[PDB]
Symmetry: D2
Subunit: 504 residues, 4 copies
Amino acid sequence: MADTFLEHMCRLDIDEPPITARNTGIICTIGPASRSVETLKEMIKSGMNVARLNFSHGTHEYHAETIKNVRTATESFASDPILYRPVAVALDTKGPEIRTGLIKAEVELKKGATLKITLDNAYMEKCDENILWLDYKNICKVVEVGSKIYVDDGLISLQVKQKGADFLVTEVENGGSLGSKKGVNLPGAAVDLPAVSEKDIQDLKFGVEQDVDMVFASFIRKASDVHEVRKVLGEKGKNIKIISKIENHEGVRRFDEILEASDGIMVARGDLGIEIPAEKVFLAQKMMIGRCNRAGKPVICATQMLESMIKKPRPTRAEGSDVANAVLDGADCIMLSGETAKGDYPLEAVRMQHLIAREAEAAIYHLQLFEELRRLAPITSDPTEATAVGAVEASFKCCSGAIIVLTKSGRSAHQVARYRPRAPIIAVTRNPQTARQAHLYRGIFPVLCKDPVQEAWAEDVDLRVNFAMNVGKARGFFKKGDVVIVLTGWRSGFTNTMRVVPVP
Amino acid sequence: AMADTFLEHMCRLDIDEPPITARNTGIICTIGPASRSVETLKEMIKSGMNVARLNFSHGTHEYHAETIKNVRTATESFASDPILYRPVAVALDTKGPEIRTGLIKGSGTAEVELKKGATLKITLDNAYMEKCDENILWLDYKNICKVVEVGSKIYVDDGLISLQVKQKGADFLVTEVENGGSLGSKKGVNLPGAAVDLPAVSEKDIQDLKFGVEQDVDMVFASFIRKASDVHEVRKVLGEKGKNIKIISKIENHEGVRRFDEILEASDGIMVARGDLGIEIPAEKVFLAQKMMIGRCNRAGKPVICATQMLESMIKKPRPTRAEGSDVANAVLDGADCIMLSGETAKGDYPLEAVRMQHLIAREAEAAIYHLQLFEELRRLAPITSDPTEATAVGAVEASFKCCSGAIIVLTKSGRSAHQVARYRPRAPIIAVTRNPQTARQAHLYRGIFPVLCKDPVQEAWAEDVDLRVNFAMNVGKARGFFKKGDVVIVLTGWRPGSGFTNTMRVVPVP
Amino acid sequence: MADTFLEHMCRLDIDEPPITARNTGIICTIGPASRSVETLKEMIKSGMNVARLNFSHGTHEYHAETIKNVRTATESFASDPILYRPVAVALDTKGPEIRTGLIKAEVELKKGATLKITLDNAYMEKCDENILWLDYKNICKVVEVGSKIYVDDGLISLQVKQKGADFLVTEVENGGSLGSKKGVNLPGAAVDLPAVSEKDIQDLKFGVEQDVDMVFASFIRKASDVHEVRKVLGEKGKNIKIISKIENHEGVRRFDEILEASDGIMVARGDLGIEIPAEKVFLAQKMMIGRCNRAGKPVICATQMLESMIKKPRPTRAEGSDVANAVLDGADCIMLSGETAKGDYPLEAVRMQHLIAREAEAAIYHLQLFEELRRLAPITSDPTEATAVGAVEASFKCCSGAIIVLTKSGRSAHQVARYRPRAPIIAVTRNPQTARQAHLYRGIFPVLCKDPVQEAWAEDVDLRVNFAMNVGKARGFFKKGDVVIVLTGWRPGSGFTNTMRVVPVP
Amino acid sequence: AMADTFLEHMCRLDIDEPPITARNTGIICTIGPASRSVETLKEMIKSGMNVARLNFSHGTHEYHAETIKNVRTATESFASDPILYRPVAVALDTKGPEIRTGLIKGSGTAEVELKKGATLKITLDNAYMEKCDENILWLDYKNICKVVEVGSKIYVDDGLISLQVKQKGADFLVTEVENGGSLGSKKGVNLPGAAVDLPAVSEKDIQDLKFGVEQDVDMVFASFIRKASDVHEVRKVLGEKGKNIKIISKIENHEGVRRFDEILEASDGIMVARGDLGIEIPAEKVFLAQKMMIGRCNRAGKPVICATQMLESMIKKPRPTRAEGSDVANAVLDGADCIMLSGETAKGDYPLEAVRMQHLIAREAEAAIYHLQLFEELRRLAPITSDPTEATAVGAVEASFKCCSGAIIVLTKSGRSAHQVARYRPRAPIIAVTRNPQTARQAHLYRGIFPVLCKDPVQEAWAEDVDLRVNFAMNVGKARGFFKKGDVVIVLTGWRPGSGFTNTMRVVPVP
Ligand SMILES: O=C([O-])C(=O)[O-]
Ligand SMILES: O=C([O-])C(=O)[O-]
Ligand SMILES: [K+]
Ligand SMILES: [K+]
Ligand SMILES: [Mg+2]
Ligand SMILES: [Mg+2]
């Protein structure tokens, strides 16, 4: 509304409540703190849209049981289709990780002490303060004397003092408590591990068997890595979405070809901020969100967004700012990892991301955003593109309560979301996978129609539209006499009709 | 357009890029001796005329009834092909509170020379009303001595001759010529700064407006409007029988500019009547008033006409001056909905060349509009509304830009749906399909509306009817060269018959 | 101040007086109506800044006398250095003109009649309704059956029906009265003539001898044409400004290379509107003005701006609009031709351009114009460029009465003018030619300091700044207590303007 | 800032593009046990500390006098080389109307575990002020029972523990534990929504402020400012002797946000004190208040500080969390003049790494600012004035962008000329040359200002005095790597000594 971004900031009002709808999807990592069906039901009620399974840990049998619990909780609400919320399942691959071994349970590494790194498997369960095993058998080929090795989210740091043929002698730079099977980072080293290992192949086939909705591919460095994951999913998994995790320097450098090959991007800030200087992570995050926004592809901001809530019921002020600014940047989804997998306050963490995301969406400077997105998108002969941007423009003109989109594949609703309306996008589908995957796109509130198909086209259209009207009324997005925008076809790939209709 | 700044947009204008076929700006032609025959009117229509203006400053009711007959005979000679038929509107331009001189005396030369520094007596004695000459001039404003004083300036004939009042009398004035010149018969007089007390709607005006209602004219151009109550009185004369006739207030004096907002609110549209305006206010200020008025009409979504002397030299020459070509283009760049020809078509030697030149310039200028900025500004200065038709309109225009559509096709009964699209100034032509002949004629007032009159019978099933009128628009656009099979067009329709229900926008390929 | 151009337009107010200063230069063509010392004096008082001498007509002896009269009229005001106005002298070359012979007097040409065009010089003084001689001797090699030939301001038009050896048989398409020695246009034909004829070389050498300030080079088609003009003016004329007249299709197509080679541009709309379709001239006009504004080179809009005032004391409404829109477009100068060379109301024509230009300058949307000029202009290590744009920003911030610029060559003042401040740019120089050429630049009000040079540089700066203070007070540009911007150097000579000061008017 | 849109500007951010040497955002470090020794303060200064914050919520006048002495000793250890000397400001942060609990009892564990649903009695009986435990909790707000009601929430220890009042008494409250946790001694208590009637300026605060004046502090961070009259009270206490001390109002409750405008008018600057603010208002609204206040301070040209938990994890860890890296960067991108460290430097294990991290992030964020849009908007929202100083400042900032200058050099007495430059947010560092030590330290409050203290005697020739100080600035910039010989800088000077005469801008090559 204000004519400048500065005036817009000056008018932000803490006493102005936001609208009901929350447009940014929330991705929760499942683990011991959130694995029970009972807790999952509350997670869903608190706002979880996507359950993420971290395949860096756990057996297939452990993950099959998590998936089972997630679906039990999700389907416990299916008896009321107007209130049912689809919940997607994401498989986050291990990828080319480096891990330490088992502590012979922690030991205290002291700054200045010597610590020897061994590849001898006779020590893989006998790590202590003098000797440390790790599973990267080629480490001696890629690090030099003077190299830095980081352990456990980059908190422990070691300096290589001597390099043998199959061992390293290091000095502890930043010490502290060292546990078992901790992650290792070698920034600057040309780590030669494969993008898709044999474990990754087994995990990906398991995801197809288990009917997952998306894959979060760790440590993607180039387009050929994405093509490899895509080849493994094969024809049977061809509709599974591949989200490439950017988390090293090469992935940032090669981001454009990775984006073109991917269905979406995760800014995987944990590893990313150890691989590049921490003071540069915000630049990469904003670069990648902007480029994904410009391309109309989903982008996830992830890792440590509410980290202190693993142990505290309230977040720090930096965490509140970080969630809000991710939404203001343009992130389609935000994510929780330890805060929901292992923390003491998993439901409070979900509710806080819901609350902050909703406040941040109300603070977006839509006047400039809508202008620049349209200026940066080319002209096209696609009738669905023109109808989508026309519908969004109409939605700003009448401050509609929603844009209702009927969609089989999701494509129609994605095209609308790319132009970032303020109003929620109620995407009506009969395809359950479409409904689960639509959570990746900002603004899309998927609803799963279960009424049988009508033989007459016009009748089946009116049925799904009335379904959306009832969902919107039930959720409090709008009320009788409000005005909504409705996008339909006139005959998949034929969305070309916009109607401005009052809610009955 | 596409450059990120207006300055770069200017730098990229290319005389070698042809414009599109469609011409969006309406052309209003004043009919007179040079254009009155059915034959010539047929060529005027072919050349681009959209509205025939009848100037009631001259002519009897018999005379104007015959002009209207000939306009309609020429217009309906094209009706046998509904695809190519062009509606032609009829406009009545009132005389209003004009001041005119008398006739030059029989003896002597046809015109008298008023020489700088000479004395000239102005009389109201009717014994001189047909014996005007270089010593004594009669005029028909019987109260003129009451509203002028010594030192007052009096202008005669398009402001070209100027007098200064040296002595005031009971029923005369003694003046000194300042700007001399040749004086003919029955010339217009202006008293800038004087409080002229003639009514906005005279007894003659009432009879003319009542005549216009009976003859079924489409619009009235109301001369010398100074305030909203002037407009209301015109509206009251037109009454219930003429309630659908559009009132265009002519702004031609300082008070009309001063009270412009209330006049615009009461009016259906505005004419910037630059002839009288440039005499009532300093000539160097007219462009300011023009740009202010076009801007405010654009903001309000009401039609605005730029009028008078746009191609003046073409009264005697077959090509216009460079100033005239620039004037026509800048009126369109300003945002005028219509442009107008007066003497160029009513009396000049090249009426068809004048119409053709306005059609050519307007089309080039429309291609030069910086739509990127204009569309953004119109949206920002337009309020949010709970009106579904308004949301649909702006949504259709945005979609029209996104796919570079060949047209926006709008089914409309009253015209309103199409006018709401026109207010947002799409590049593409707006084909307004109506079965209402008056709607089709009045639609010429709005930039970009190309009205087509469907004469097919109403199909029993609404959906079938709609598709009939859409396909009619498709045939018209293909025939006029606006688009071809496989192009994308925008189509706006209602959800039920009647006015007020336009809520549906479709992006469809042309068959 | 409005946030949108649309709202800016809506707020234009006919009752708001403009400031006193008029920033757009007025160029007047001198001719029979305006040649006398007595009239030239009134032309200067009415606002004429540049006297244009059209070398399509007249002998060197005739033009030498014109120049003497201009300088007599101009120096008649030198008595008072604070009110003295410099007046430049412009030579407008004949160029590759095509002219008909002598009728030997006018004939009528009827539509549909036959007219024969001959190169036979026996008929050169025997033009009539049947036979017409023109001086372009290769015309048959460039025209084709069916081509259009335009005579006399494009008002008569002929279509070639038969093409011979030294002959053309035409049909009269647009008739009318035909006098002697009228101009011919062959739009679409690839005319062969030199851009610099031998007569042009003698005329340019004459201009150097007469100390003219600028050359208006007719029918410039390419950069090498401009190079050839520069070569002829030579070392002796190296400071004469060369303005290329764009008036054919080739000049528009090759505008960029011509602008780069030129000191400035004239949009010569008369010939241009016959060479290209009349409805396209406004596009060429705004293109060239925009490109000249972007390059920071002067651009003149010319021809038929107030044409009806050749015979009438007031202009038409389209002529009022044309002058104003030229200024709104961004033209640095506007020009009068027949209106002052030969018409009945030369002083009224000048006064009207002065009045319209001032009203138009007050209506410019400076908020957007200053934003876009900066965006399009490069980052530079040149200190005077940075100082100039800093001075313009400062002038907008404090709504200053003027920007005062001391300049030897003009360049420092030209750099300010490119950023288009609202405030007048008082350019103080001791170089009289600098003072005359500065009229080419929108906003520059040049003043000629005649005081001797003070031994102390610092005192000589203050003296020249105090001179501008007195000029601005006398002309009513500002009053004591107003704030102005002052631009100066740090050491004497050209190329050191790096100092901006905000100071009260004493 | 070169892309035509903010979105493309984002798309072009390049992690491999190194930033300029200069860091423009001031860093304020809270001093405490971790950072109080002279040896550590010297390393704090080298790491980037610009302002030392003394937290008067804790410690005696003796303690704070010694802190001030050590800060001055470390700062003046660099004074031998005036080219490299960095001024360091001293800030006094008042206790204000704090509410705190008592000491945990000596018996049992050091902290007591409060369990969800347990009963906890709050008492005002002083016999318990050092005997708090899991059943009884003393606090020091003797009027608490008069401002809370049954149902009210009471928060303890950074809002981490929450209690609901279930029963009221004359000197006690019975509460139920809502959010349990480990309770230590002398923790902060918040009563959001309650009408706490503690004075803005207690007698203790008055003694602290008077001690601040006597110890020559540079600025005061006034806690819990709710209204302009609170600010006027601080200013009156500082009095004539303290009239040059800058008052920074800390906004940390709902009423201070509500009355922000009148507070900002009365204050020299603002601190967004997010610690208490995020307990007094919902945590999810803090970012809205932060961005509003930063925007309104930027619009007003007054310094704004973003404070609290910016690098909180670094109290215990040598690297920050990803959210902490993003928070610091976004504070700078919002427009914060300074950023602050609290426990990170006052008591943490990694004070030097925390300072260095803020310096590294702020420098990267400053290179990412979209100056193209920022400079346009700051100019559009700023008034036209006859103030010649203000016109000179915006002109130098425009010139700095035009030639990509290495610095803007500003000679200033009071600092104001350099403040006026900083308000328009140049990319180039502002080297503010002053002989007033207090001006130099206070200049750290303003984004972009690099203060340097000239220790040369005044030259009798004004022109020679200017030149001496400008060349000092040249040598500073070369030593610090802000520019080299042949680079171009902007120089602002006045036309006579004293404040208010800045009116000269020069573009000069670096000698
Ligand atoms: O030569 C000229 O000035 C013209 O043709 O307009
Ligand atoms: O006082 C403070 O600094 C706070 O509460 O954030
Ligand atoms: K993983
Ligand atoms: K010439
Ligand atoms: Mg009139
Ligand atoms: Mg010419």
